[PDB]
Amino acid sequence: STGSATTTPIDSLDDAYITPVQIGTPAQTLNLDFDTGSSDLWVFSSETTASEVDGQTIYTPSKSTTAKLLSGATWSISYGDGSSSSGDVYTDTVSVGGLTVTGQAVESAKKVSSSFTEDSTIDGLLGLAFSTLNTVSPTQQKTFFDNAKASLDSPVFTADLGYHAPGTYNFGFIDTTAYTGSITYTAVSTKQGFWEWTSTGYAVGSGTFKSTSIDGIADTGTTLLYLPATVVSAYWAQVSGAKSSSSVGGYVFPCSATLPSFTFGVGSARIVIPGDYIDFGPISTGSSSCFGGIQSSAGIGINIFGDVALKAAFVVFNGATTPTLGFASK
């Protein structure tokens, strides 16, 4: 089997992407944030505290003839950005782009943090990291991809995120028309439960490529590119007037600037992030100070190849017995 679903930016900045997901019988379609940095499929629901729902579409398990409470199971997750959610668990039929999994754990939110409530466009998350990170207790549950893997034509999914445009998540096949050149594959460590890999270096604009190992994670659920302070300083030094602002929370730059590109290495291959992808616009409405899309990871503990980086590539998440990542230009 295979599946193919379009993923759409939630706003004009590409802050996140939503993909329609069919849950239950008859189908209830929710728009989920596919997140290769986490491993829970959780949804706003009829169980979510009413004051914490503000425009989201909810899953109502009592209206699904295939929903079954997973007795005793609870979940609770906290994300790198400080947001969180928690609740109980059903199993139900879940379909993405024509690919159906029966008995998928659907984690129903009883509580969500304010950042989720305030974002009416995201109805939940669909985690695509390794199932070892799933938070369901006392019996950890599998991700949608893990459940689908054996049925797929090939045990892979691909992320093709658009710049200010829709893109595609495919399951079970590699669309050879969706990228240019070849796909360069690189080794993955699953020791932390992430799609963790080592970039071979970087360049700023037309500058020389610096060969240096940068360990990080491929994370579709993170907006920006978070890299070591040395690398980030070298990037922003090429933008006149750019500075790190403790009060704003990162590097800002004059909105009148033209940003240089940023290249990262994948083995001997190179992925070029155009400068425009690094512009996240005014820090507040009407400001002439703009927020940068490359930021320091120094306070995170891990480097994160988020959407800024991934949207410049066609990315293969190869879930074979020994997983690997692939990157192609597009």
Token pair of 86 as six digits: 């928690």
Query: Closest Cα partner for 65 from 105, 103, 25?
Result: 25
The contacts found for 140-145 with CB under 8 angstroms, 24 or more apart, are 141/70, 141/73, 141/89, 141/105, 141/107, 142/105, 143/39, 143/41, 144/41, 144/94, 144/96, 144/101, 144/104, 145/171, 145/317, 145/319
Catalytic residue among 95, 199, 261, 297: 199
How many CB atoms are located within 10 Å of the residue 241 CB?
11
Specify whether the backbone of 267 is left (phi greater than 0), alpha (psi in -120 to 50) or beta: left
Token pair of 273 as six digits: 């992030």
Resolution in A: 1.1
**Domain limit, last residue, from 120, 146, 174:** 174
- State the residue for tokens 């799933």: 134
Q: Same structural domain for residues 102 and 179?
A: no
Catalytic residue among 35, 40, 88, 123: 35
DSSP state of 151: G
- Tell me the one-letter amino acid at 228: P
Q: Could you list the residue range(s) of the whole structural domain that residue 225 is in?
A: 175-330
Alpha helices for the chain (secondary structure H): 114-117, 144-148, 229-236, 307-310
Q: Same structural domain for residues 128 and 225?
A: no
Distances (CA, A) of 258 to 37, 111, 206, 236, 241: 31, 42, 14, 12, 11
The answer to whether 272 touches 205, Cβ cutoff 8 Å, is no
If one counts the domains in the chain, the total is 2
- State the residue for tokens 């590097």: 251
Q: Please give the sequence-ordered ranges of beta strands (E in DSSP) within 79-122, or none if there are none.
A: 84-96, 99-112
Q: Same structural domain for residues 92 and 164?
A: yes
Answer yes or no: 199 catalytic.
Answer: yes
Q: Same structural domain for residues 241 and 149?
A: no
* Rg (the chain; Cα; Å): 20
| Backbone phi, psi, residue 154, to 5° | -140, 145
By CB atoms closer than 10 A (0-12, 13-18, 19+), residue 106 is: buried
C-alpha to C-alpha distance for 140 and 318, rounded to whole angstroms = 22
**Domain limit, last residue, from 123, 141, 174:** 174
C-alpha to C-alpha distance for 28 and 106, rounded to whole angstroms = 12
Q: Same structural domain for residues 167 and 238?
A: no
Convert 195-217 to b/e letters by CB count within 10 Å (16 or more is b). Answer: bbbbbbbbbbeeeeebeeebebb
**Domain limit, last residue, from 124, 141, 174:** 174
- State the residue for tokens 């979510």: 48
Answer yes or no: 54 catalytic.
Answer: no
Q: Same structural domain for residues 204 and 159?
A: no
Q: Same structural domain for residues 144 and 215?
A: no
CATH of the domain at 314: 2.40.70.10
